[PDB]
Paper text:
The membrane protein FlhB is a highly conserved component of the flagellar secretion system. It is composed of an N-­terminal transmembrane domain and a C-terminal cytoplasmic domain (FlhBC). Flagellar FlhBC consists of a globular domain composed of a four-stranded β-sheet surrounded by four α-helices. The globular domain is preceded by a long N-terminal α-helix (α1) that connects the cytoplasmic globular part of FlhB to the transmembrane domain.
Author numbering:
A (entry chain A): 232 to 263
B (entry chain B): 264 to 348
The structure:
Amino acid sequence: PEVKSRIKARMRELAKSRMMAEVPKATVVITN
Amino acid sequence: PTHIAIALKYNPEKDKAPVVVAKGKGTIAQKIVEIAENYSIPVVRKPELARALYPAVEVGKEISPKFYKAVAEIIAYVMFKKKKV
């Protein structure tokens, strides 16, 4: 369904902006 | 190349353990590294761990007691190096 997936996509996108903004608050990052 | 990252926030008085503030694959991972390097937040290459840590936890929630073993070792290395200057 076009709308439900567009809502999902957008929630995914919004979750990511929150997360990347919270990175300036990190003390350590583990990397591959 | 393949890309992954796990960002952690940890204060010694307030947090009993490290909070996962971000996790990332591909350009997301790269973004976390970049902002962090941008903030002079340390960045540690530990692939077997980063791999083992990713599916395990989630954003905003403190790591499992199980991980206290390898994470604390890292926070330690990070802080030993930063002491001299």
